[PDB]
Amino acid sequence: PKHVLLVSEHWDLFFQTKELLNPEEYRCTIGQQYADLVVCEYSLLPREIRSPVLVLLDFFDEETSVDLLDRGFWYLIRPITPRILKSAISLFLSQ
C-alpha cells in the first residue's frame, strides 16, 4: 500500500478522499506541516524549497504557477473535490 500524505486543514477533503481510495493500495494520512506522494496546500508549502508532491491552490496567479512549476511542483487550482483528488493521486502513483 503506497503512502499518501495530505498536508491540509480541509478535513472533509481528507476523509472523503480517503474513503474513495482502496486501502489495500493506498494508505492516506494527514499532516499539519511540510511518503510515496505528498499532497500539500500552497498555504502550507515552504517558500524555500524545490521538489525532491502535488500542490493545491485556492486561486490562479501566473507568477505563483510559474514559480511552482520551475521548483518541480505540479498543482491543482480549486475547486478540488474528493473525486478529482482520488483520481489525481491514482494517476501520479501509477507513473
Add this chain to the structure above:
Amino acid sequence: AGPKHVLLVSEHWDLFFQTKELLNPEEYRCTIGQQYKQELSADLVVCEYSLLPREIRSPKSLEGSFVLVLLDFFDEETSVDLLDRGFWYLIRPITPRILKSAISLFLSQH
C-alpha cells in the same frame, strides 16, 4: 542526445510561437498541428481538450508519446475522466510562461 520534440495540437498559433521562443532550442524542438496525432519523434504531445478524441487513453505501460491536455474550463467529471484516462492537464489561463514551465517539468520528470 539532441532536443526533445514537443508537438502542440492547437489552433492557438500565438501561444505556440510565444512558447517556442521561451524554450531553449538545444533542449526542446516544438512544432504545431491542428488535429490530434503523434509523430515518431514526439516525446510529448500537448493537446487542446477540444481536439482530444474522447475515446482515447494514455495507458499505464505506455510505449508511445506522453500527452498533456490543455483545458478551457473546470468541470468536475471532465477532470476526473481525463485523469482516469491517463492524462494530466492544465486549465486556462495558460500563458506562454506557464506552458514553457510545464513542458519543461513534464519532460524532466518522465
